[PDB]
C-alpha cells in the first residue's frame with residue numbers, strides 16, 4: 001500500500017502480463033522437480049521462489065518494503081542461474097525477464 005510497494009506491485013503485474021509471456025512463463029509457478037525428473041533440484045536450491053509465490057506474498061501484505069520484494073524476485077533468478085547450465089534456454093529467458101525487472105525497479109520513486 002506504500003508508494004514503493006505500489007511500484008513493486010506494478011512491476012509484478014508487468015512481469016505476469018502477456019507483454020513478457022514468451023520468456024516469463026517458466027517463472028509463473030514453482031518448479032515441479034518431481035514432474036520434470038529433477039531429483040537433485042531441492043538438494044541444490046534451498047529456497048525456491050517464483051512469481052505466483054511473490055504475488056501471494058504481495059496480496060497477503062508479507063513484503064514490508066521494496067527491498068524485501070526485490071530480494072524474492074532476484075532469488076527466483078539466482079536459483080535459475082545456480083541450477084541450470086548457462087546455455088539452457090530457461091537461463092536466456094531468466095536474463096531477459098531480469099532485464100525487464102531491473103530497468104523498471106531502478107525507476108523506484110524516492
Ligand SMILES: CNC(=O)CN(CC(c1ccccc1)c1ccccc1)C(=O)c1cc(C)c(=O)n(C)c1
Nearest residue numbers: 025026027030031032036038079080083084089090
Ligand atoms: C510450466 N512448466 C515449466 O515452467 C517448466 N519449467 C521450464 C522448463 C525446464 C527448464 C529446466 C529444466 C526442466 C524444464 C523449460 C524448458 C524449455 C525452455 C525453457 C524452460 C520449469 O518448471 C523450470 C525448471 C527449472 C530448472 C527452472 O529453473 N525454471 C525457472 C523453470
